[PDB]
Paper text:
The tri-longin domain (TLD) RabGEF complexes represent a family of RabGEFs with a unique conserved structural core. In each complex, two subunits that contain three longin domains (LD1 to LD3) each form a heterodimer, which is required for catalytic activity toward the cognate Rab GTPases. We here report the cryo-EM structures of the Mon1-Ccz1 and Inturned-Fuzzy core complexes bound to their cognate GTPases Ypt7 and Rab23 in the nucleotide exchange transition states, revealing a conserved catalytic mechanism with distinct modes of substrate recognition. Thus, TLD RabGEFs rely on both conservation and variability in the switch 1 regions of their substrates to realize catalytic efficiency and specificity.
Last, the TLD proteins Fuzzy and Inturned act as GEF for Rab23 (5). All longin domains of Fuzzy and Inturned are well resolved, but as in CPLANE, an N-terminal PDZ domain of Inturned is not visible in the map. However, analysis of the surface properties of the Fuzzy-Inturned complex reveals a mixed distribution of positive and negative charges and no conserved basic or hydrophobic patches. Fuzzy-Inturned does bind neither liposomes generated from a neutral lipid mix that has few packing defects (PO) nor charged liposomes with increased packing defects (DO/PIP/PS). We also could not detect any interaction of Fuzzy-Inturned with liposomes that have a high content of 5% PI3P. Our findings are not consistent with the previously suggested function of Inturned and Fuzzy as PIP-binding proteins, pointing to alternative mechanisms. Thus, the Fuzzy-Inturned complex may also be localized to its target compartments by interactions with recruiter proteins that enable tight membrane binding. Furthermore, Fuzzy-Inturned could be recruited to the liposomes by CiBAR1 and Rsg1 but not by Rsg1 alone. Thus, CiBAR1 serves as an adaptor protein for the mammalian CPLANE complex.
Residue numbers in the entry:
A (entry chain B): 302 to 447, 456 to 495, 512 to 569, 587 to 607, 623 to 648, 798 to 856, 876 to 885, 899 to 925
B (entry chain A): 8 to 34, 38 to 251, 259 to 342, 362 to 418
């Protein structure tokens, strides 16, 4: 990752100043290192290509593929208003559909943070914050590291999905959680979403807002997984703009709970009291988490959640080549998502039972199924050829 | 479905031609082509290639060949893939080499004469751009048709080759080769696809003598190619480094088998071949033998348009080249309403990759077993 080139850049499109210095063009540029000086120099072709293809083609540039020094580099564009935002990473680690999903998430998160991304980048005070966020994001994209690898192995697709890791809730615990959340609601609370061990254990938030908050947490290290060390006292109280006056994101992480609230224009004390009485629910959920479809990535896009076997399950399901089986699943799911993504573009403008088979000795037969007429959903399955 | 191809003088920075196939084969500002030339050159100086700059509606691919020629494509095709464009540029450069050669293409730059030499290439280029009936332009494999179980055809081809004193003699139909000399088979893959394609693209004449420069055989030695039209849509290719009568010496007693394989051009399958009723498309690929058997019409009931079936198979191949390169695939597609669409299957086994289009009612459970049975049936054929 350190050696591979990677750039985030914010040149000013349609610049009309004869001072062609890099500062005049570039408004923000996080790396500013050896791995990015090349792209900083070659920004001219990016600008010229973007404007020319905007001219000839009714649509703007979404992706340019440059074979730089013998290695492939995908750069994703974004033209909004006299401004252009470019993200370039090597292909051999992040494929192009993953890069497009990643730029979509990045733009969404920036708009979430500082509203108009133009004001996000023009300001100088927030530059250290943007640099830290982009450092973490680039590290996530290029360095999967830093049972500890299953989450990293699957994050190729889990970050791609427009959903959130959801846990099959027992009904009694479900109503207990709903009662607790209602008590918490009883500024202005616009909903909430409680997570356990990184699993979305309850969600009263609207789907778009919940997705925005979850991806904001994912871009950081807030959301844990694999039952990490109990979150001590991390409380975040920030301003946000979830495409809807002044809005605040609150989030308290105590023990394994990762509770979040959205507020509209002292609440930490009441939410702490609310989660304090939730001292028995974790016990009731521990053994539930503990307790031939070898792997399913069943999704619910309308709800914004998806269900996959827990890490304890895959540890129980660990077999001869299962550690390789899961990663093979998760890299093929990217291609399945790519074709389904083309189909989704076709659907939102106004294919369905894709599958492959592997033998790198058991017939994995990973298959992606799409549902559109009912509540739209995706189902990625494994099964031996016998079944 | 609009494609705008461009060839440019790389070092000179002057347009060479702008063959386009927008809305079909019948079909640009100087400033815009200068702009793409400028961005390509800026990439070249900065030692960074420009493989693709795909937009939402279009997709482009540059190719700097021998640092002397520059190739651009503007493909607004729905579901266009990078591999299809890369193959198209590679093979169109192969065509340009065939029509002119290494010289006058690299090194020496003809400012205005090269226009005159390239004037002849336009027919082959726009045949390439249009939705032809062959796949050699995509799969890089020569399009073949199984002969009607006759070795006498190969024996007579060898006899004709001996009589004409040439090791490159091949009987080609509708652009698909049905018989060839061993030298023709061993001949390099880009020109192997090109030569039958050029013959098919050429208008039918009694006999044609044309100069060709083999991209791998002889880019500098101007080989001569003779097309002998025994009957329309079938030709004899005689490729040598001048007035043979041997066509009636050898092919006259071979008239009956030749008439038997005459309709096999579009058929690309032996008459009465046992195949599963669900099969609506065969695209057998033998990469070891560098051949492809492409049957598009085993049934004209569902998806009656053969053009639609060919486009579907080509898109499936462009999607499976990324996956494949025991392993199999299936990409059931179409409208979300049940009983519509198609089922596309892929199998790879011993360099014998095969694509199967199936009926919309074809069951999805036994798709792999169906593919294995089809591959076993077609194994002796190719």
């Amino acid at each position: 990752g350190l050696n591979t080139p990677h750039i985030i850049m914010y040149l000013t499109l349609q610049l009309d100043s004869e001072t062609s210095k890099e500062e005049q063009e570039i408004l923000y540029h996080y790396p500013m290192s050896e791995a990015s000086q090349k792209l900083k120099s070659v920004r001219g072709i990016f600008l010229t290509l973007c404007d020319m293809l905007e001219n000839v083609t009714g649509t703007q540039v979404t992706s340019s593929s440059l074979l730089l020094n013998g290695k492939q580099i995908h750069v994703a564009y974004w033209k909004e208003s006299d401004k252009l935002l470019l993200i370039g990473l090597p292909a051999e680690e992040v494929p192009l559909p993953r890069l497009r999903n990643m730029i979509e998430n990045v733009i969404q998160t920036l708009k979430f943070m500082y509203g108009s991304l133009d004001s996000a980048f023009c300001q100088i005070e927030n530059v250290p914050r943007l640099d830290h966020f982009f450092n973490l994001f680039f590290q996530r994209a290029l360095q999967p590291a830093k049972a500890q690898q299953y989450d990293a192995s699957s994050a190729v697709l889990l970050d791609n999905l427009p959903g959130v890791r959801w846990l099959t809730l027992p009904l009694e615990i479900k109503m207990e959680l709903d009662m607790a959340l209602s008590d918490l609601e009883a500024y202005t609370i616009l909903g909430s979403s409680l997570f356990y061990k990184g699993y979305l254990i309850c969600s009263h938030l609207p789907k778009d807002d919940l997705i925005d908050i979850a991806v904001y947490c994912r871009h950081y290290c807030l959301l844990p997984l694999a039952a990490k060390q109990r979150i001590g006292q991390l409380i975040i109280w920030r301003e946000v703009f979830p495409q809807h006056g002044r809005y605040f994101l609150l989030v308290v992480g105590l023990k394994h709970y990762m509770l979040c609230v959205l507020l509209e224009a002292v609440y930490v004390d009441q939410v702490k009291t609310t989660l304090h009485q939730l001292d028995g629910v974790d016990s009731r959920i521990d053994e539930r988490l503990a307790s031939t479809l070898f792997h399913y990535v069943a999704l619910e896009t309308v709800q914004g959640i998806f269900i996959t076997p827990t890490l304890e399950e895959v540890a129980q399901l660990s077999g001869s080549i299962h550690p390789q089986l899961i990663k093979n699943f998760h890299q093929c799911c990217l291609s399945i998502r790519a074709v389904f993504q083309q189909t989704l573009v076709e659907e939102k403008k106004k294919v369905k039972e894709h599958g492959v088979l592997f033998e790198c000795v058991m017939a994995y037969w990973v298959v992606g199924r799409l549902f559109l007429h009912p509540k739209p959903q995706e189902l990625y399955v494994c099964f031996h050829d016998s079944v | 479905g609009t494609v705008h191809l461009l060839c440019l003088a790389a070092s000179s920075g002057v347009p060479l031609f702008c063959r386009s196939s927008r809305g079909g084969a019948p079909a640009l500002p100087f400033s815009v082509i200068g702009s793409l030339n400028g961005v390509h050159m800026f990439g070249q100086n900065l030692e960074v290639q420009l493989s693709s700059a795909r937009t939402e509606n279009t997709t482009v691919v540059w190719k700097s060949f021998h640092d002397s020629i520059t190739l651009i494509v503007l493909s607004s095709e729905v579901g266009i893939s990078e591999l299809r464009l890369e193959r198209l540029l590679q093979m169109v450069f192969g065509a340009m080499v065939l029509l002119v050669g290494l010289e006058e293409l690299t090194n020496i730059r003809n400012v205005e004469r090269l226009k005159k030499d390239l004037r002849a290439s336009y027919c082959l280029i726009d045949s390439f751009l249009g939705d032809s009936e062959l796949i050699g332009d995509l799969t890089q494999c020569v399009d073949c048709v199984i002969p009607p179980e006759g070795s006498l055809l190969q024996e007579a081809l060898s006899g004709f080759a001996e009589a004409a004193g040439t090791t490159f003699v091949s009987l080609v139909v509708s652009g698909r080769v049905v018989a060839a000399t061993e030298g023709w088979w061993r001949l390099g893959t880009p020109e192997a696809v090109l030569l039958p394609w050029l013959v098919g693209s050429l208008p039918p004449q009694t006999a044609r003598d044309y100069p060709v420069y083999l991209p791998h055989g002889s880019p500098t030695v101007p080989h001569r190619l003779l097309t002998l039209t025994l009957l329309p849509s079938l030709e004899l290719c005689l490729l040598c480094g001048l007035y043979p009568q041997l066509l009636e010496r050898w092919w006259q007693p071979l008239l009956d088998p030749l008439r038997a394989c005459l309709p096999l051009g579009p058929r690309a399958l032996p008459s009465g071949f046992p195949l599963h009723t669900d099969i609506l498309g065969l695209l057998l690929l033998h990469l070891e033998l560098k051949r492809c058997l492409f049957t598009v019409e085993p049934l004209g009931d569902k998806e009656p348009s053969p053009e639609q079936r060919r486009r579907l198979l080509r898109n499936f191949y462009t999607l499976v080249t990324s996956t494949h390169f025991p392993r199999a695939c299936y990409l059931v597609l179409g409208t979300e309403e049940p009983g519509t669409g198609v089922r596309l299957v892929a199998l790879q086994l011993g360099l014998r990759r095969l694509l199967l289009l199936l009926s919309p009612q074809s069951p999805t459970h036994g798709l792999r077993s169906l593919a294995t049975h089809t591959l076993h049936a077609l194994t002796p054929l190719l």
